[PDB]
Amino acid sequence: GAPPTIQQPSMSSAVALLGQDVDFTCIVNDLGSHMVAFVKADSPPRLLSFDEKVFRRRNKYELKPRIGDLHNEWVLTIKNVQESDRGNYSCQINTEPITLSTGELDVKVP
Amino acid sequence: ASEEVMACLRQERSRVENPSQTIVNVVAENPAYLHCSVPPDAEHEIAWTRVSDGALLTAGNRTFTRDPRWQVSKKSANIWVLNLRRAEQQDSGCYLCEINDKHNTVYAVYLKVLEP
Numbered sequence: 150g151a152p153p154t155i156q157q158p159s160m161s162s163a164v165a166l167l168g169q170d171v172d173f174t175c176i177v178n179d180l181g182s183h184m185v186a187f188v189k190a191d192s193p194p195r196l197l198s199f200d201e202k203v204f205r206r207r208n209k210y211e212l213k214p215r216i217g218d219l220h221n222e223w224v225l226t227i228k229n230v231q232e233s234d235r236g237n238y239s240c241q242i243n244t245e246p247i248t249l250s251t252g253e254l255d256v257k258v259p
Numbered sequence: 260a261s262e263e264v265m266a267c268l269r270q271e272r273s274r275v276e277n278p279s280q281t282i283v284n285v286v287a288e289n290p291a292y293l294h295c296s297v298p299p300d301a302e303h304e305i306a307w308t309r310v311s312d313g314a315l316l317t318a319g320n321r322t323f324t325r326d327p328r329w330q331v332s333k334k335s336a337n338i339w340v341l342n343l344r345r346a347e348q349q350d351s352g353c354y355l356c357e358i359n360d361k362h363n364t365v366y367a368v369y370l371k372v373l374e375p
């Protein structure tokens with residue numbers, strides 16, 4: 150029917166407290182044979198997960214694919230957030246052009 | 260033009276200088292080969308990304324993009340190669356190879372495709 154779309158509310162910008170776990174949720178409809186990646190949009194950008202695999206720091210990130218009521222929520226958890234985790238996080242679908250949703254994480258220290 | 264190449268190559272994050280080519284000139288319609296070095300005997304995985312849009316091109320030994328012109332392979336024990344089979348002028352720009360190692364190594368390559 151339709152190409153892949155990222156549905157509201159995805160990649161919500163947030164301020165978290167030092168040490169909290171933070172979820173970024175990418176709700177994807179009509180994914181079909183496409184795939185989803187999560188990236189930290191720093192300079193340079195950093196790959197966090199691709200398809201159903203976490204790429205680095207296995208105890209730092211958790212990926213839960215296709216959850217929620219409609220089996221369409223992709224949730225990346227960043228555990229124990231630090232000042233270094235501040236910045237922009239993007240969910241990307243490998244359409245051409247890519248389909249992106251981005252949210253900014255702030256982390257407040259005591 | 261010099262600033263564009265510098266803005267790309269400044270994105271390298273490495274313990275030792277990149278040993279491979281980081282500026283690649285090719286003629287449109289020809290293939291391009293971008294190299295990513297990994298330590299001997301390590302078992303790291305690598306990912307290639309296009310900086311202009313942030314598109315993930317390959318990750319591990321799999322192509323991620325659906326653009327059929329890209330393939331990743333292990334050229335030798337210490338070298339991964341991103342092969343672009345039919346370059347076009349619009350492919351020019353910055354590409355990054357990220358390694359999942361402890362220091363989170365990133366190598367940057369600038370590709371210039373010349374259009375006759």
Ligand SMILES: *[C@@H]1O[C@H](CO)[C@@H](O[C@@H]2O[C@H](CO)[C@@H](O)[C@H](O)[C@H]2NC(C)=O)[C@H](O)[C@H]1NC(C)=O
Nearest residue numbers: 189190191192234235236237238251252253254
């Ligand atoms: C995250 O991305 C936002 C944009 O979506 C960045 O905010 C912008 O910051 C630049 C300077 O870095 C300004 O020129 C823009 O006007 C800002 N736009 C908005 C909408 O705020 C933000 O800096 C990024 N965070 C990082 C890189 O840590």
